[PDB]
Design a protein around this nucleic acid. Structure first.
Ligand code: TTP
Ligand code: MG
Ligand code: MG
Ligand code: MG
Length: 341
DNA sequence: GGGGGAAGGATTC
DNA sequence: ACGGAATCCTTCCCCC
């Protein structure tokens, strides 16, 4: 089994560069303005010109304008980046019908047939790499190794517009070299608990007691990190399917009043039923961000699909129980739709 | 004990 | 200043 993974580079940012090359060369910050005050909101993603200076996503736009005050600031446009993705994704399937679409900028393959040996994989690299680079004008990093995981680390250590392969011999040198945070599935919150147990490099996950993992990072994670440590891991590529949809609007100003919220909750439903197109959600949730940025949702599954009417009716029933079980005000309010039929 | 779920909060990206 | 989309994990319950 041989895996050729692909990460679309600074995708949102890049797309816009393809939709107006005048940018390709300049710093570019894509961001969702919340509308409250001028330039309020956050960065969605930044290219390497803007990132190479501290501008990354999640950070306030204002802080951004503070570091790079002469960068192009463009609102985000998901739809477009969503199709420029599909046009590309379909352009990968003609390389294996068994590909795994992880994200919008990630696809998983298994050219175990198409390519046995590595140097041979390394070429199916520049050939999938050179083609998506000539059809949609997009440049993407390629990662090659034994499983899906070391495939990310592959593209991770060589992106952007890069390439790298990890001989099975290397999937062994990094098990003891690679920090634990650079491990796919590991985010800061987890890279800590682990450091608190003592762990740092992959391999260190066998030292500590197994019940010492379970309790600190869950067992799914435990078995997960244990596996890769033994070179075993080896998991099958899987077509994968989105199993939830939802929008999360931003209050012009914090609101605790069930009527100032309403107009928002409904922009969220519509902007979910449209994205939902042809999917019947048996379950629905309501997410609401408490002013001091804490989240608190509510839900409810039905024995049948949810008609847009039910979608408002119960939508309002859940927001209320929040405004009730809690007391903070609300900065963000959305709606999740899951468990389709 | 645990399967079959439902829910709300947590963590990743 | 502190968006946004999804899923991952731990918990509670029901009735066998
Ligand atoms: C880490 C992090 C990422 N994100 C968004 C911003 C990053 O661009 C994205 C993760 O990207 P990555 O996949 O980590 O890097 P990338 O270049 O492959 O992604 P992209 O092609 O979009 O640039 O997730 C957040 O919104 N908050 C976060 O804390
Ligand atoms: Mg990407
Ligand atoms: Mg990504
Ligand atoms: Mg990580």
């Amino acid at each position: 089994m041989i895996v050729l993974f692909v990460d679309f580079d600074y995708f949102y940012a890049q797309v816009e560069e393809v939709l107006n090359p005048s940018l390709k060369g300049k710093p570019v910050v894509v961001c969702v303005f919340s509308g409250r005050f001028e330039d309020s909101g956050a960065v969605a993603t930044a290219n390497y010109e803007a990132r190479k200076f501290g501008v990354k996503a999640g950070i306030p736009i204002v802080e951004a304008k503070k570091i790079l005050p002469n960068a192009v600031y463009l609102p985000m446009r998901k739809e477009v980046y969503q199709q420029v993705s599909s046009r590309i994704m379909n352009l990968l399937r003609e390389y294996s019908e068994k590909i795994e679409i992880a994200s919008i900028d990630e696809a998983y393959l298994d050219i175990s047939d198409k390519v046995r040996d590595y140097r041979e994989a390394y070429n199916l690299g520049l050939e999938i790499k050179n083609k998506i680079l000539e059809k949609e004008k997009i440049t993407v990093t390629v990662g090659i190794s034994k499983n899906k995981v070391f495939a990310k680390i592959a593209a991770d250590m060589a992106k952007p517009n890069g390439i790298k392969v990890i001989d099975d011999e290397e999937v062994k040198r990094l098990i003891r070299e690679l920090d634990i945070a650079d491990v796919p599935g590991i985010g800061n919150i987890t890279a800590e608990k682990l450091k608190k147990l003592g762990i740092n490099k992959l391999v260190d996950t066998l030292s500590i007691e197994f019940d010492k993992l379970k309790g600190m990072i869950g067992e799914a994670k435990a078995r997960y990190l244990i596996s890769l440590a033994r070179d075993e891991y080896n998991e099958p590529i899987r077509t994968r399917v989105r199993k939830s949809i939802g929008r999360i609007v931003t209050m012009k100003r914090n609101s605790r009043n069930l009527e100032e919220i309403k107009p928002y909750l409904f922009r969220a439903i519509e902007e979910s039923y449209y994205k939902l197109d042809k999917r019947i959600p048996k379950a629905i949730h309501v997410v609401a961000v408490t002013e001091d940025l804490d989240i608190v949702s509510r839900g409810r599954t039905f024995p049948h699909g949810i008609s847009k009417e039910t979608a408002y009716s119960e939508s309002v029933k859940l927001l209320q129980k929040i405004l009730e079980e809690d007391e903070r005000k609300i900065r963000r309010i959305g709606v999740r739709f899951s468990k389709f039929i």
